[PDB]
Amino acid sequence: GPKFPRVKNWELGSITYDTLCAQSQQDGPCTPRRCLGSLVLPPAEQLLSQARDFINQYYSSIKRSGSQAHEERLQEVEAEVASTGTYHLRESELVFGAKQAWRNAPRCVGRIQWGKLQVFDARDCSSAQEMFTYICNHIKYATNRGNLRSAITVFPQRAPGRGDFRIWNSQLVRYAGYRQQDGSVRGDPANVEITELCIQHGWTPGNGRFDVLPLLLQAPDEAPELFVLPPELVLEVPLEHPTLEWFAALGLRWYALPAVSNMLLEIGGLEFSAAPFSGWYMSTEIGTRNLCDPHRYNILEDVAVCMDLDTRTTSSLWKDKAAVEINLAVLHSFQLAKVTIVDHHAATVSFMKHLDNEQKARGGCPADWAWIVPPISGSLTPVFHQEMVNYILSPAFRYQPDPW
Amino acid sequence: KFPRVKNWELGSITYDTLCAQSQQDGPCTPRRCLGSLVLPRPAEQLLSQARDFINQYYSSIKRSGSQAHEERLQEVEAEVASTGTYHLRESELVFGAKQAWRNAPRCVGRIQWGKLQVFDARDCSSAQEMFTYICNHIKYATNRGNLRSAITVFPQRAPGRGDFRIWNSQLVRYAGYRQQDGSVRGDPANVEITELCIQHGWTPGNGRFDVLPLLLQAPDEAPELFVLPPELVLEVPLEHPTLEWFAALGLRWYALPAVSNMLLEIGGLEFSAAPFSGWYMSTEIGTRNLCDPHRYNILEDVAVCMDLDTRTTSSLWKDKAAVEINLAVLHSFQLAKVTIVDHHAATVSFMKHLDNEQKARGGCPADWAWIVPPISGSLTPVFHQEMVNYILSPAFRYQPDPW
Numbered sequence: 042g043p044k045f046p047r048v049k050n051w052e053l054g055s056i057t058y059d060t061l062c063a064q065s066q067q068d069g070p071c072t073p074r075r076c077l078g079s080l081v082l083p084p085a086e087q088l089l090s091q092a093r094d095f096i097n098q099y100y101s102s103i104k105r106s107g108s109q110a111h112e113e114r115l116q117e118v119e120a121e122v123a124s125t126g127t128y129h130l131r132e133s134e135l136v137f138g139a140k141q142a143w144r145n146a147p148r149c150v151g152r153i154q155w156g157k158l159q160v161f162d163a164r165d166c167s168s169a170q171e172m173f174t175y176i177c178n179h180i181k182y183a184t185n186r187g188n189l190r191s192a193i194t195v196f197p198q199r200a201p202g203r204g205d206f207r208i209w210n211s212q213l214v215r216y217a218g219y220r221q222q223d224g225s226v227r228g229d230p231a232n233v234e235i236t237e238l239c240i241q242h243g244w245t246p247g248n249g250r251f252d253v254l255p256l257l258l259q260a261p262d263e264a265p266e267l268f269v270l271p272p273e274l275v276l277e278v279p280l281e282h283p284t285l286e287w288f289a290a291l292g293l294r295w296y297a298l299p300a301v302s303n304m305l306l307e308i309g310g311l312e313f314s315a316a317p318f319s320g321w322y323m324s325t326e327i328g329t330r331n332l333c334d335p336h337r338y339n340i341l342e343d344v345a346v347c348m349d350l351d352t353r354t355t356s357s358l359w360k361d362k363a364a365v366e367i368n369l370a371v372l373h374s375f376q377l378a379k380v381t382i383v384d385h386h387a388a389t390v391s392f393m394k395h396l397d398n399e400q401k402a403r404g405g406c407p408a409d410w411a412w413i414v415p416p417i418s419g420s421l422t423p424v425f426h427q428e429m430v431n432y433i434l435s436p437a438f439r440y441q442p443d444p445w
Numbered sequence: 446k447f448p449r450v451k452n453w454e455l456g457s458i459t460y461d462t463l464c465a466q467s468q469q470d471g472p473c474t475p476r477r478c479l480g481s482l483v484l485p486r487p488a489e490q491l492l493s494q495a496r497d498f499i500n501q502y503y504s505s506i507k508r509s510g511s512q513a514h515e516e517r518l519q520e521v522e523a524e525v526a527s528t529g530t531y532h533l534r535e536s537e538l539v540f541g542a543k544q545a546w547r548n549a550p551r552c553v554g555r556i557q558w559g560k561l562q563v564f565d566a567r568d569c570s571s572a573q574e575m576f577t578y579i580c581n582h583i584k585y586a587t588n589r590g591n592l593r594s595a596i597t598v599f600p601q602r603a604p605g606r607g608d609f610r611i612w613n614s615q616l617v618r619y620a621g622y623r624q625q626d627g628s629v630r631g632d633p634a635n636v637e638i639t640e641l642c643i644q645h646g647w648t649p650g651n652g653r654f655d656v657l658p659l660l661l662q663a664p665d666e667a668p669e670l671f672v673l674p675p676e677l678v679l680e681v682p683l684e685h686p687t688l689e690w691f692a693a694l695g696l697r698w699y700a701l702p703a704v705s706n707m708l709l710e711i712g713g714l715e716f717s718a719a720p721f722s723g724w725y726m727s728t729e730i731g732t733r734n735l736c737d738p739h740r741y742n743i744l745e746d747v748a749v750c751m752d753l754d755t756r757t758t759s760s761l762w763k764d765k766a767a768v769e770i771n772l773a774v775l776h777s778f779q780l781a782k783v784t785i786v787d788h789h790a791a792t793v794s795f796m797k798h799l800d801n802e803q804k805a806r807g808g809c810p811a812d813w814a815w816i817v818p819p820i821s822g823s824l825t826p827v828f829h830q831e832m833v834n835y836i837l838s839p840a841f842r843y844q845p846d847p848w
């Protein structure tokens with residue numbers, strides 16, 4: 042009937058229509074001739090319309106659309122742009138935008154929590170030293186001794202001519218990756234380049250599998266400066282298994298706080314190049330991707346040998362059995378250490394509740410099926426059977442090229 | 446523009462140029478991707494698709510531009526101009542069907558695409574003959590557990606009449622009996638087709654694994670009911686290699702995965718009844734058919750026998766039971782000497798296929814959400830491989846249920 046994407050849940054048989062995608066201003070990578078949905082990485086007049094659109098979004102969310110404060114906030118932005126080329130956000134606009142960007146993130150399964158985000162304004166920040174203080178404060182608050190709290194810290198926006206604020210690391214917490222003489226990697230292969238960059242900038246490297254990297258923080262038009270995190274601010278969890286007693290002897294560990302620091306937060310055409318955000322982990326991120334990806338820690342064969350599985354034939358499902366127990370260890374160990382974590386079942390169920398909330402609230406929810414479905418036990422989770430529409434809305438978290 | 450395709454495990458990059466041969470449009474537009482969606486929402490054009498296919502065929506046999514090529518283009522043109530349609534040579538049909546499987550973006554077993562036994566059944570004029578052709582297919586394809594890929598191709602659609610159809614979605618399906626209290630005994634996916642059979646005079650059973658009869662439909666006639674000889678339907682009882690109690694659950698599955706409701710399009714011609722089969726990948730039985738909430742739904746049952754903590758999600762009881770169920774299927778098929786491929790072996794072979802196809806055609810249409818298995822996704826190499834999805838012809842397509 043309706044001329045919007047028809048969306049079906051194959052487990053439940055139910056149908057919905059996504060009208061929200063009509064509000065998308067930005068084109069994605071697809072066309073009628075081919076689908077590029079599986080790809081990980083595929084001005085004056087322009088600023089105003091983005092600005093006008095965002096202010097419109099803001100006033101709708103507080104229900105004052107068409108009003109005198111609404112049209113005066115418009116006039117105030119259009120004037121400020123007309124005389125300087127840019128404009129500034131009010132505090133409550135920034136809070137709304139940060140939440141809306143998270144709410145808008147198609148690849149995040151944790152969005153049931155979007156409304157509950159602690160926004161630290163750091164738009165006053167004027168040094169790389171100051172950035173470090175804001176970051177330490179964020180970690181302290183967000184970690185909260187294992188009882189994790191979502192947070193974002195927003196540093197000053199891009200300015201015409203003047204250079205960006207950048208955190209060079211991809212996360213606030215990352216393990217070093219050390220390239221060997223043989224060509225292998227000790228630690229995390231994901232973090233090789235950033236480890237090398239930290240050395241180039243004078244860090245004295247360690248040589249463990251789990252060395253917490255220092256931060257490389259860059260203030261406008263300055264070279265980055267190197268900052269070591271005080272070990273006590275960085276909460277970690279040693280991995281053991283609830284029944285396989287040798288698993289603890291493996292020496293495996295992970296950090297409590299997932300904090301993405303290299304993404305750009307865009308609100309009303311304003312670009313916040315340093316806006317680190319954090320939540321808590323879904324257990325498969327650590328147990329499946331970080332610990333079992335071939336190009337990460339790659340511990341599957343090690344664990345399967347300890348489990349005494351037949352690693353000579355695929356048809357033994359030794360990979361499947363090891364991944365299950367590793368994920369179990371991650372969950373059991375975070376639960377033992379009283380550190381917030383969510384398994385892929387709980388997470389996906391809660392995301393299904395989120396889709397229903399948003400269907401009523403906005404008439405749809407942009408969602409990236411390949412990223413939403415967990416990397417183990419996919420069809421065992423309800424999201425596998427849920428069709429999804431993906432599109433870009435703004436405010437948004439966006440990828441940005443590396444500063445170097 | 447040509448898409449840049451990256452494997453994130455290896456760091457390697459390819460460029461898909463095969464996608465420019467896509468004459469058909471998919472569900473996506475620049476404004477929104479509709480990739481995870483399962484179903485889709487004149488003599489001049491028939492002749493153009495016919496010219497393009499005939500060209501494809503004569504390119505395959507490396508005899509392009511030849512006398513036979515031109516003479517065959519004349520034949521096709523002449524036949525369309527006069528009758529509004531044309532007919533394929535058996536050799537061309539064989540080519541088209543292989544090319545259809547090759548082009549199927551949702552299929553992980555395309556490494557096998559050149560090895561396909563093609564039965565021409567276009568000399569079929571009754572439901573009775575369809576049943577005959579179908580029984581021979583089943584006998585050939587099953588081959589006492591040494592499965593071989595086959596397609597039987599019934600007469601093409603025609604402007605002036607109803608279609609040949611197999612009403613069943615697969616040649617072998619277990620009945621699904623709706624209960625007064627809403628619940629379903631047997632396979633819930635087959636409630637509707639089980640009900641169509643009963644209405645057309647089938648004596649039902651009361652089992653979980655009752656093999657359905659086939660409803661075969663000759664054009665503009667009511668469909669007829671045909672019961673498959675029990676000896677033609679190879680089935681495998683399920684047991685587990687270390688859990689004695691598993692065999693007691695009485696689980697079983699059939700050996701032959703034979704899809705019978707899709708339409709085969711070759712060079713504009715459409716074949717509405719063209720059942721095809723290969724062999725199972727173990728996750729289709731162990732994960733989807735047996736563990737889907739809306740299928741046989743056996744997770745909890747197995748979890749309890751394993752004495753697992755059903756009470757919470759974080760004990761990963763679902764993951765554990767699912768792995769044992771999949772192992773039971775692989776064990777059982779291996780024990781019965783019936784062809785099957787696990788998801789690791791299957792996806793490794795698909796990576797080799799992508800590579801072969803990158804060299805042969807400059808790309809390979811693939812639907813990532815369907816290629817990546819339903820358990821242990823990132824544990825297989827395809828998870829880390831970017832894929833481009835698009836529609837090439839010849840093709841398999843969905844078509845409406847004929848009722």
Ligand code: HEM
Nearest residue numbers: 143146148149150151154191318319320321322323326438
């Ligand atoms: C509160 C608990 C949270 C959970 C369980 C969660 C879960 C996830 C997961 C599993 C991913 C997939 C990425 C991967 O495969 O590694 C993801 C991505 C993402 N999350 Fe969340 N998240 C949470 C909080 C947040 C917060 C607070 C924000 C920002 C305010 C956020 C924004 C994003 C964004 C932008 C992505 C996409 C990242 C990319 O494309 O690389 N998430 N999240």
Ligand code: HEM
Nearest residue numbers: 546549551552553554557594596721722723724725726841
């Ligand atoms: C030879 C062994 C084969 C294996 C292991 C295999 C495996 C698979 C799998 C796992 C799927 C996804 C189905 C699902 O998840 O439910 C699939 C889909 C498909 N396969 Fe294959 N296949 C094989 C042979 C064939 C053959 C012989 C043909 C046709 C001549 C074919 C054509 C297709 C088509 C058209 C689909 C899409 C089905 C749909 O859209 O619902 N396959 N295959």
Ligand SMILES: CNCCN(C)c1cc(C#N)cc(CCc2cc(C)cc(N)n2)c1
Nearest residue numbers: 211212299301318319320321322323330331
């Ligand atoms: C580990 N597999 C790949 C996942 N990827 C590519 C990935 C890369 C980066 C970065 N930088 C960041 C993420 C998001 C992880 C995340 C973020 C937040 C706020 C919460 C959470 N639970 N996970 C995911």
Ligand SMILES: CNCCN(C)c1cc(C#N)cc(CCc2cc(C)cc(N)n2)c1
Nearest residue numbers: 614702704706721722723724725726733734
């Ligand atoms: C439980 N998963 C089902 C996915 N679906 C909807 C699905 C529907 C139909 C049909 N008609 C067919 C399939 C594929 C079955 C199949 C076909 C072939 C040739 C080989 C094979 N191993 N499996 C899958």
Ligand SMILES: C[C@H](O)[C@H](O)[C@H]1CNc2nc(N)[nH]c(=O)c2N1
Nearest residue numbers: 079080081411412828829830831
């Ligand atoms: C090729 C494919 O897009 C890529 O491997 C994706 C698949 N799905 C994912 N899903 C999540 N959540 N995170 C990822 O990094 C990926 N990687």
Ligand SMILES: C[C@H](O)[C@H](O)[C@H]1CNc2nc(N)[nH]c(=O)c2N1
Nearest residue numbers: 425426427428481482483814815
């Ligand atoms: C909604 C979603 O696209 C749907 O459940 C798909 C996901 N991927 C799949 N993949 C395969 N191989 N078979 C399927 O049935 C499905 N189902």
Ligand SMILES: [Zn+2]
Nearest residue numbers: 071076473478
């Ligand atoms: Zn798409």
